[PDB]
Amino acid sequence: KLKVAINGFGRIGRNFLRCWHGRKDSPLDVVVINDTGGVKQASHLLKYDSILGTFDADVKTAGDSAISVDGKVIKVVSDRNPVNLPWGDMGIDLVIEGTGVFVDRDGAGKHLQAGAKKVLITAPGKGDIPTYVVGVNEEGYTHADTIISNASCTTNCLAPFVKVLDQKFGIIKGTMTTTHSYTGDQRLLDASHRDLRRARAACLNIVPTSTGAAKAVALVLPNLKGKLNGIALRVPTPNVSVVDLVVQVSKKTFAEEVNAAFRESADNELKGILSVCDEPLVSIDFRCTDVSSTIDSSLTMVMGDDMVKVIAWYDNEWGYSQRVVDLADIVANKWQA
Amino acid sequence: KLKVAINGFGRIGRNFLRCWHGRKDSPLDVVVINDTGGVKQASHLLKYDSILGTFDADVKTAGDSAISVDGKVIKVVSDRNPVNLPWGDMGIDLVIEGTGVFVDRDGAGKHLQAGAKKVLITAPGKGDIPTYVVGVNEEGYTHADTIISNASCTTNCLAPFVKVLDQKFGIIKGTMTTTHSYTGDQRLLDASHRDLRRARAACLNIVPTSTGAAKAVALVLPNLKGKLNGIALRVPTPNVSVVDLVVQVSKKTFAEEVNAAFRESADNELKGILSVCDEPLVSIDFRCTDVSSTIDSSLTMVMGDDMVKVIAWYDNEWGYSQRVVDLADIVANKWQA
Amino acid sequence: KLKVAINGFGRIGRNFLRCWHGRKDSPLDVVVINDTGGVKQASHLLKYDSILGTFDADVKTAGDSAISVDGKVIKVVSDRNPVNLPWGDMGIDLVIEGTGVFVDRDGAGKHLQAGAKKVLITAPGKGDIPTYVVGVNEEGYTHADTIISNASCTTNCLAPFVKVLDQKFGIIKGTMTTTHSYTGDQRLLDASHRDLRRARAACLNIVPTSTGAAKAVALVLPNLKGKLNGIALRVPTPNVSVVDLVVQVSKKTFAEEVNAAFRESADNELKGILSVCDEPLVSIDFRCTDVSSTIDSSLTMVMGDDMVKVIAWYDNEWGYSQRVVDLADIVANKWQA
Amino acid sequence: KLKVAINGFGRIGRNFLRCWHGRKDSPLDVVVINDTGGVKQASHLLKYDSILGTFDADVKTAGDSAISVDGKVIKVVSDRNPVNLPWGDMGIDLVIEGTGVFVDRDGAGKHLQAGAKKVLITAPGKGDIPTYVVGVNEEGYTHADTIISNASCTTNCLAPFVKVLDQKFGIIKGTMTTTHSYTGDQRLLDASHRDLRRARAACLNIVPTSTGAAKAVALVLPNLKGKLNGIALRVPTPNVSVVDLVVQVSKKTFAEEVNAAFRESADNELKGILSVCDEPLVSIDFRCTDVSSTIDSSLTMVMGDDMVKVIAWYDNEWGYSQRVVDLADIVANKWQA
Ligand SMILES: NC(=O)c1ccc[n+]([C@@H]2O[C@H](COP(=O)([O-])OP(=O)(O)OC[C@H]3O[C@@H](n4cnc5c(N)ncnc54)[C@H](O)[C@@H]3O)[C@@H](O)[C@H]2O)c1
Ligand SMILES: NC(=O)c1ccc[n+]([C@@H]2O[C@H](COP(=O)([O-])OP(=O)(O)OC[C@H]3O[C@@H](n4cnc5c(N)ncnc54)[C@H](O)[C@@H]3O)[C@@H](O)[C@H]2O)c1
Ligand SMILES: NC(=O)c1ccc[n+]([C@@H]2O[C@H](COP(=O)([O-])OP(=O)(O)OC[C@H]3O[C@@H](n4cnc5c(N)ncnc54)[C@H](O)[C@@H]3O)[C@@H](O)[C@H]2O)c1
Ligand SMILES: NC(=O)c1ccc[n+]([C@@H]2O[C@H](COP(=O)([O-])OP(=O)(O)OC[C@H]3O[C@@H](n4cnc5c(N)ncnc54)[C@H](O)[C@@H]3O)[C@@H](O)[C@H]2O)c1
């Protein structure tokens, strides 16, 4: 019922389409896809995926301007400048901005200039753009927001349990490190890049790099403003990442008590968002998990009674994409966005 | 003495600079580097390399327009359009075209429009562009050629021993497959690309893809016109590749006889170009080899007395780059190019 | 109905169990599993698999001597010497020998000494052991065979279409190279090994190594005795391999004609064994395919009218395992083995 | 002058030999090598190494019982049981125990039973075995120790700067996570292992696993007893690892002040042990570094004025091996060990 447009049919754009496809009675209607590549690629790459496997659905090209998934035809256009997009003419309600190059107001605002009524950025927004994390602060969303951000994948993994730690133990200060799978923003082989570290061969190195995910947490949990920071360590895995959080808390506690608090929420307010795994698994076992964060209970540690360490898993592609769909659903539910 | 300009400071551009740097009494004088990135990257990536290791030389940035290697300053400019380059103003004799995007006459000819006297493409040339392979047909080079090609890496590996097989046994017809390391032209993760196979995650797949290296062989060895063809299989290794050649020959022979013929040439006319290894090594052992082709003698096979199979190694980055330097030296020796 | 025992619960043993599990009305009854590890590992590794994903079935440990899959309990023992196994006492009909260390008559014969009635080696047999390839020579199997071999994975991929090429064009001589995923027989990091090449880090090199798969083809297709040979090139992919066959044939032909011959058989006598793919896919797309060989039609080439080159894919773990189940079914059908 | 024997010619054994080889005026004389493999492997693997490259020295086999490096012959034996070793008969002073299977007193004591005067374990010792970390507590070593441990690689990376943080700021409590390269103790493909996580394919996963390196730190810095803990995250890189330490300190401070303290020591008491890097490098750039720990100054962070986070690099193979040589030198200097 909500006319949706996907801008940037990459890793997130395609995972988004597939997540949506598997949902029942969706309020969303994906009608257009805009990428710079062509219709043959959109169709081919949607069907075959080195990470998700072959898409269990009939995907084919429809003429020279559309693709069809199980019969449902989807228009495909190719305009590098968002202002030239036929959003107005098609009556596009919501644009899923996943190109990674229009994350600020002037850039994302271009979809509005093209006629779309609203924009949902699949990444942190730069400047003054409301950012939401489903299960943490989504309720503060209002239909008046013309441009919104669904934060980064690491923020969606961290925020959920950070919220629990803060509510139950009181976070004084903390730090975090994410051992993250590589992404398209890194180079296959040493090549130019503004980030001198992300410029080095991704599958051959442990690559330190910045992340705002920690500061970003404060955007959705204001009580943590100026209390967290961290970095990212990119490693040679194609998908699935893990966060390592260390915080000093006010209430003395111990590992199993902390784990118990997470199960409490995982069974209630954070059901579907946060999960707690008690099996000794490795990254690949968490591929395709719908939650945005899974605590590895056995790794939980507590030093000096108030220094808590939590290790949580997250499928940065699929889990995050379930959240974008989730946020899109909310936008659909708060009146024709 | 020959004023040289490098256009495209990528894998080949940087290996070129380092190969040149290690040569004694070079006729070449590298004075300019043009890439789209900046001076900080040029300096940083020249010094640190995930494949060659840290460059054993003092590399640093010089102001905002140059880098210096052991004191020798090198101008660094950044122009995406070759026609705007200061080749004429600087009096550039030879431009090493290694961007991979100006391989035809109109594109490479743009360096000429900018003032450079000659262009050496570090890849197969499209259209009517003389192509040479040092040790196979370099002697046919004339200073009149304004634009020349040094062929592809696979051609420089194949041509040398193909020439021996043809001279000694008479090649009737043949085919070839190169199990090739991935390159910057492939995608880190499934992403758009004109080649639907090269679009898939490079470090997760065996990726079939086209190669003209086989037909290209006929350009340097006319006697083989229409006698060879093949394909490339890209695999998850960052550097070093291997060719697998299968040919039906006129003179009946046997493996050790074929190997012997290769050592004959490797010790004479092809010394420095072709090598023959009798040790049971693996790809990484061939990293940084100066030759452009190394026969793995023990893998040589002969079926039905006339079907010869040869397996040869090659450092597609460094070995090929030694050849570009070699061809540049020839250009310097045939009068101020 | 056939009491089956799995000896060596490794890659093949576990894929075997899962292939079997997905079959309908199987004549096989897996009752025992013998590995050297324990019951916790058998259960854990059967459930979580870095290549197949999490097993969609209820797997758990049952006491200290068994595991259960969806309720069906399976005895688990741990004896390094096959002669001490309780095959006789349990009345084991067929032993699936997949340890890789009992491939000759004296070694595999030990299961017989322990009481098992028959042994099916999941690899080439050394010495005088009947070897079969489903779809090529299975019909020559007789219940009198006490020890049989299902050949190697590469043989099961090659034999099927080799048979077609021979029947329709007449193979004079040929050679082959398989660009193969690494296996447990290779070392993670340079370490001792009888094979000086398989001793080198598997995920960092292209590793040449021997293969009898070519000569082995003659065992199942006697008409090809002494007409084929080849080698293996191990590369950094965890599963799925590809064969590259080059043969000189008697009848002149051309690529599309050869492809057509393969579709003829793929639709008839080799249905379920051989498949022909016309899409430009990469290795990961062939993961979990039930056939044992898939021709990449677009890569097919023909030089000098009689030199045919065919490129075929194969899931060396899963596809091969479907064949072991298949051969086990045949053994069950030819009287209580 | 000190007769040294290497037991276990694996990654550490071979790096040890090469580190030693590059030292000047060494007090050590390596005369025997005992591994289970053969003389051909010892020679071959010492010469060709997927991580260090080809050994720049003349290595060859000498008969069927020795290898020679640049002329120096070294006896090679093969006994799986240390008690059968000819240590006494050869008059072996010190045995470098690097097999990873004799880390407790009864197991390592077997070399003593064979006649060796002393044993140096290239890993944490289990039970009551003095453990030393060069640059932290080596001075407490006495010749009376018959069996000693050089700790783990992570301990040698952590202890050095931990000592500085404690001396200058007072460590109250802390935790640590090492994003570690995989090692021979992990499986190439999902296979049985006592550790259910280390049993999963190493090059395909981020693998959590235990480490005593944190508790081990207290062995060499008693002041930190019961103040630290942590875990290891194994990732798909063949060599070089990184430690992430988070501690609450007594004296309020800030990042650059902490970095300054490290340079103070790196220029004095810890020169050659601890280094401080100010360049934005990635793991591969730290390959072959002789120090055992290199602080990445730009990643240093301080939260709430007393929570310090330090990121340090370390070549777990080569850097650690320089330390074993170093500890061996000390043993040689404290009288004929
Ligand atoms: N990969 C992840 O795990 C991940 C997780 C969370 C958030 N994100 C965010 O999502 C965004 C996209 O990430 P991705 O990994 O999918 O990248 P990607 O490279 O796979 O996808 C970007 C896509 O946009 C297209 N594109 C680029 N410029 C365009 C333009 N001007 N007009 C139209 N199409 C254009 C590309 O061709 C490509 O298909 C980034 O902002 C990233 O930070 C990524
Ligand atoms: N990598 C190999 O093994 C190899 C071997 C032989 C031949 N080649 C050929 O060499 C060429 C480059 O290959 P590469 O692997 O070094 O690639 P690369 O991506 O590492 O290098 C290309 C470089 O050119 C720059 N560039 C791109 N467009 C530009 C423009 N318009 N103006 C200026 N600079 C521009 C890029 O920023 C980059 O630094 C290709 O033609 C390739 O076929 C590569
Ligand atoms: N991986 C493949 O693609 C593949 C394909 C076709 C055929 N094969 C053949 O299958 C066999 C096994 O290969 P794999 O890859 O599954 O190896 P693997 O290492 O994963 O499995 C071997 C298993 O046998 C166990 N084992 C070893 N020695 C034993 C003993 N004495 N008693 C009991 N258990 C013992 C091991 O602990 C392990 O679980 C080999 O003969 C191989 O050539 C493998
Ligand atoms: N790789 C690293 O980074 C590293 C770093 C620090 C400490 N260590 C420690 O060093 C030890 C060895 O580690 P590694 O990585 O070199 O392993 P490795 O597998 O490469 O080497 C072990 C070697 O010992 C041999 N061996 C095994 N059992 C034997 C026996 N009974 N008798 C004789 N030789 C035997 C093996 O054949 C092999 O050559 C372990 O204790 C490990 O914890 C390893």
mmCIF file of N, CA and C in Angstrom, chain D residues 15-72:
data_model
loop_
_atom_site.group_PDB
_atom_site.id
_atom_site.type_symbol
_atom_site.label_atom_id
_atom_site.label_comp_id
_atom_site.label_asym_id
_atom_site.label_seq_id
_atom_site.Cartn_x
_atom_site.Cartn_y
_atom_site.Cartn_z
ATOM 1 N N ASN D 15 60.685 -20.765 12.573
ATOM 2 C CA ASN D 15 60.929 -19.334 12.746
ATOM 3 C C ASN D 15 62.111 -19.166 13.704
ATOM 4 N N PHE D 16 62.192 -20.046 14.702
ATOM 5 C CA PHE D 16 63.281 -19.994 15.673
ATOM 6 C C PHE D 16 64.614 -20.132 14.953
ATOM 7 N N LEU D 17 64.729 -21.169 14.127
ATOM 8 C CA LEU D 17 65.956 -21.414 13.390
ATOM 9 C C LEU D 17 66.341 -20.212 12.536
ATOM 10 N N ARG D 18 65.363 -19.618 11.856
ATOM 11 C CA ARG D 18 65.649 -18.467 11.011
ATOM 12 C C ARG D 18 65.979 -17.217 11.808
ATOM 13 N N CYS D 19 65.332 -17.023 12.951
ATOM 14 C CA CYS D 19 65.648 -15.848 13.761
ATOM 15 C C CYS D 19 67.099 -15.986 14.202
ATOM 16 N N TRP D 20 67.419 -17.149 14.770
ATOM 17 C CA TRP D 20 68.769 -17.459 15.235
ATOM 18 C C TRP D 20 69.789 -17.225 14.125
ATOM 19 N N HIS D 21 69.493 -17.762 12.945
ATOM 20 C CA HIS D 21 70.388 -17.633 11.804
ATOM 21 C C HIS D 21 70.777 -16.193 11.481
ATOM 22 N N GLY D 22 69.853 -15.258 11.681
ATOM 23 C CA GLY D 22 70.144 -13.866 11.392
ATOM 24 C C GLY D 22 70.834 -13.088 12.506
ATOM 25 N N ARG D 23 71.060 -13.725 13.648
ATOM 26 C CA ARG D 23 71.714 -13.058 14.770
ATOM 27 C C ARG D 23 73.231 -13.091 14.581
ATOM 28 N N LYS D 24 73.923 -12.114 15.160
ATOM 29 C CA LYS D 24 75.379 -12.039 15.059
ATOM 30 C C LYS D 24 76.030 -12.494 16.369
ATOM 31 N N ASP D 25 77.099 -13.277 16.264
ATOM 32 C CA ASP D 25 77.819 -13.778 17.435
ATOM 33 C C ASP D 25 76.925 -14.454 18.460
ATOM 34 N N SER D 26 76.045 -15.325 17.985
ATOM 35 C CA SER D 26 75.137 -16.042 18.868
ATOM 36 C C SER D 26 75.865 -17.016 19.789
ATOM 37 N N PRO D 27 75.421 -17.105 21.052
ATOM 38 C CA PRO D 27 76.002 -17.999 22.056
ATOM 39 C C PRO D 27 75.412 -19.389 21.853
ATOM 40 N N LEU D 28 74.464 -19.484 20.922
ATOM 41 C CA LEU D 28 73.776 -20.740 20.646
ATOM 42 C C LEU D 28 74.290 -21.522 19.447
ATOM 43 N N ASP D 29 74.314 -22.841 19.607
ATOM 44 C CA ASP D 29 74.750 -23.751 18.558
ATOM 45 C C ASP D 29 73.670 -24.813 18.356
ATOM 46 N N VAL D 30 72.857 -24.642 17.320
ATOM 47 C CA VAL D 30 71.789 -25.590 17.029
ATOM 48 C C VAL D 30 72.403 -26.803 16.351
ATOM 49 N N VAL D 31 72.311 -27.956 16.998
ATOM 50 C CA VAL D 31 72.922 -29.144 16.435
ATOM 51 C C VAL D 31 71.953 -30.261 16.048
ATOM 52 N N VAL D 32 70.767 -30.266 16.643
ATOM 53 C CA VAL D 32 69.811 -31.310 16.322
ATOM 54 C C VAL D 32 68.411 -30.793 16.144
ATOM 55 N N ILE D 33 67.672 -31.478 15.288
ATOM 56 C CA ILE D 33 66.289 -31.146 15.045
ATOM 57 C C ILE D 33 65.513 -32.444 15.104
ATOM 58 N N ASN D 34 64.489 -32.470 15.947
ATOM 59 C CA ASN D 34 63.645 -33.640 16.040
ATOM 60 C C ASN D 34 62.214 -33.242 15.736
ATOM 61 N N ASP D 35 61.679 -33.869 14.699
ATOM 62 C CA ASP D 35 60.295 -33.695 14.286
ATOM 63 C C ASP D 35 59.859 -35.136 13.962
ATOM 64 N N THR D 36 58.577 -35.341 13.636
ATOM 65 C CA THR D 36 58.063 -36.679 13.287
ATOM 66 C C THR D 36 58.131 -36.897 11.784
ATOM 67 N N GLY D 37 58.126 -35.794 11.041
ATOM 68 C CA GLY D 37 58.214 -35.885 9.594
ATOM 69 C C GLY D 37 59.619 -36.339 9.250
ATOM 70 N N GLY D 38 60.057 -36.105 8.013
ATOM 71 C CA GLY D 38 61.390 -36.524 7.600
ATOM 72 C C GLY D 38 62.389 -35.405 7.355
ATOM 73 N N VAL D 39 63.523 -35.758 6.757
ATOM 74 C CA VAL D 39 64.614 -34.828 6.474
ATOM 75 C C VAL D 39 64.322 -33.992 5.229
ATOM 76 N N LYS D 40 63.559 -34.562 4.303
ATOM 77 C CA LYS D 40 63.200 -33.871 3.074
ATOM 78 C C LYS D 40 62.244 -32.724 3.383
ATOM 79 N N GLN D 41 61.352 -32.947 4.340
ATOM 80 C CA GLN D 41 60.385 -31.928 4.723
ATOM 81 C C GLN D 41 61.053 -30.822 5.518
ATOM 82 N N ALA D 42 61.893 -31.225 6.464
ATOM 83 C CA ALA D 42 62.606 -30.273 7.289
ATOM 84 C C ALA D 42 63.349 -29.315 6.367
ATOM 85 N N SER D 43 64.075 -29.869 5.405
ATOM 86 C CA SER D 43 64.827 -29.048 4.466
ATOM 87 C C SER D 43 63.912 -28.198 3.580
ATOM 88 N N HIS D 44 62.935 -28.845 2.958
ATOM 89 C CA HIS D 44 62.006 -28.151 2.071
ATOM 90 C C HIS D 44 61.231 -27.017 2.749
ATOM 91 N N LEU D 45 60.609 -27.313 3.888
ATOM 92 C CA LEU D 45 59.820 -26.315 4.602
ATOM 93 C C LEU D 45 60.642 -25.218 5.260
ATOM 94 N N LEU D 46 61.928 -25.471 5.470
ATOM 95 C CA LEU D 46 62.789 -24.459 6.065
ATOM 96 C C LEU D 46 63.126 -23.466 4.960
ATOM 97 N N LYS D 47 63.305 -23.982 3.750
ATOM 98 C CA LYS D 47 63.637 -23.147 2.607
ATOM 99 C C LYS D 47 62.452 -22.337 2.055
ATOM 100 N N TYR D 48 61.315 -22.999 1.862
ATOM 101 C CA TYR D 48 60.135 -22.329 1.328
ATOM 102 C C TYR D 48 59.089 -22.157 2.415
ATOM 103 N N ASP D 49 58.642 -20.920 2.590
ATOM 104 C CA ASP D 49 57.684 -20.576 3.637
ATOM 105 C C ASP D 49 56.625 -19.572 3.135
ATOM 106 N N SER D 50 55.363 -19.988 3.129
ATOM 107 C CA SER D 50 54.250 -19.148 2.658
ATOM 108 C C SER D 50 54.089 -17.828 3.396
ATOM 109 N N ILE D 51 54.777 -17.677 4.519
ATOM 110 C CA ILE D 51 54.679 -16.452 5.297
ATOM 111 C C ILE D 51 55.963 -15.634 5.306
ATOM 112 N N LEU D 52 57.108 -16.290 5.456
ATOM 113 C CA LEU D 52 58.382 -15.566 5.484
ATOM 114 C C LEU D 52 59.018 -15.444 4.111
ATOM 115 N N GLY D 53 58.590 -16.281 3.179
ATOM 116 C CA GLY D 53 59.173 -16.237 1.853
ATOM 117 C C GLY D 53 60.313 -17.232 1.770
ATOM 118 N N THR D 54 60.995 -17.263 0.634
ATOM 119 C CA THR D 54 62.098 -18.185 0.462
ATOM 120 C C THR D 54 63.286 -17.756 1.327
ATOM 121 N N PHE D 55 63.788 -18.690 2.140
ATOM 122 C CA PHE D 55 64.917 -18.474 3.049
ATOM 123 C C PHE D 55 66.161 -18.124 2.241
ATOM 124 N N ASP D 56 66.697 -16.937 2.487
ATOM 125 C CA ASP D 56 67.878 -16.479 1.784
ATOM 126 C C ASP D 56 69.112 -17.157 2.374
ATOM 127 N N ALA D 57 69.304 -18.418 2.017
ATOM 128 C CA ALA D 57 70.431 -19.202 2.497
ATOM 129 C C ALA D 57 70.415 -20.509 1.723
ATOM 130 N N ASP D 58 71.574 -21.152 1.640
ATOM 131 C CA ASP D 58 71.698 -22.408 0.920
ATOM 132 C C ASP D 58 71.222 -23.536 1.830
ATOM 133 N N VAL D 59 70.031 -24.051 1.558
ATOM 134 C CA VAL D 59 69.478 -25.132 2.350
ATOM 135 C C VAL D 59 69.389 -26.375 1.484
ATOM 136 N N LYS D 60 69.854 -27.499 2.000
ATOM 137 C CA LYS D 60 69.777 -28.734 1.241
ATOM 138 C C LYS D 60 69.801 -29.904 2.195
ATOM 139 N N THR D 61 69.474 -31.073 1.672
ATOM 140 C CA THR D 61 69.457 -32.276 2.469
ATOM 141 C C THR D 61 70.889 -32.833 2.498
ATOM 142 N N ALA D 62 71.292 -33.422 3.619
ATOM 143 C CA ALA D 62 72.633 -33.997 3.737
ATOM 144 C C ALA D 62 72.486 -35.460 4.109
ATOM 145 N N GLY D 63 72.517 -36.328 3.109
ATOM 146 C CA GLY D 63 72.352 -37.737 3.388
ATOM 147 C C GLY D 63 70.911 -37.998 3.775
ATOM 148 N N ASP D 64 70.704 -38.904 4.723
ATOM 149 C CA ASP D 64 69.368 -39.264 5.175
ATOM 150 C C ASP D 64 69.198 -38.974 6.654
ATOM 151 N N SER D 65 70.058 -38.125 7.199
ATOM 152 C CA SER D 65 69.990 -37.843 8.623
ATOM 153 C C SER D 65 70.353 -36.415 8.986
ATOM 154 N N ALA D 66 70.499 -35.553 7.993
ATOM 155 C CA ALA D 66 70.849 -34.182 8.297
ATOM 156 C C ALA D 66 70.520 -33.192 7.193
ATOM 157 N N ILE D 67 70.509 -31.918 7.564
ATOM 158 C CA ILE D 67 70.282 -30.843 6.616
ATOM 159 C C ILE D 67 71.416 -29.861 6.848
ATOM 160 N N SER D 68 71.713 -29.054 5.844
ATOM 161 C CA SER D 68 72.762 -28.077 6.003
ATOM 162 C C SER D 68 72.238 -26.733 5.544
ATOM 163 N N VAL D 69 72.586 -25.712 6.315
ATOM 164 C CA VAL D 69 72.195 -24.342 6.058
ATOM 165 C C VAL D 69 73.500 -23.577 5.888
ATOM 166 N N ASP D 70 73.769 -23.140 4.665
ATOM 167 C CA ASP D 70 74.991 -22.413 4.379
ATOM 168 C C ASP D 70 76.220 -23.202 4.839
ATOM 169 N N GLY D 71 76.185 -24.519 4.652
ATOM 170 C CA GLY D 71 77.312 -25.339 5.051
ATOM 171 C C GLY D 71 77.210 -25.972 6.427
ATOM 172 N N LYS D 72 76.579 -25.294 7.380
ATOM 173 C CA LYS D 72 76.454 -25.863 8.713
ATOM 174 C C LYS D 72 75.460 -27.022 8.716
#
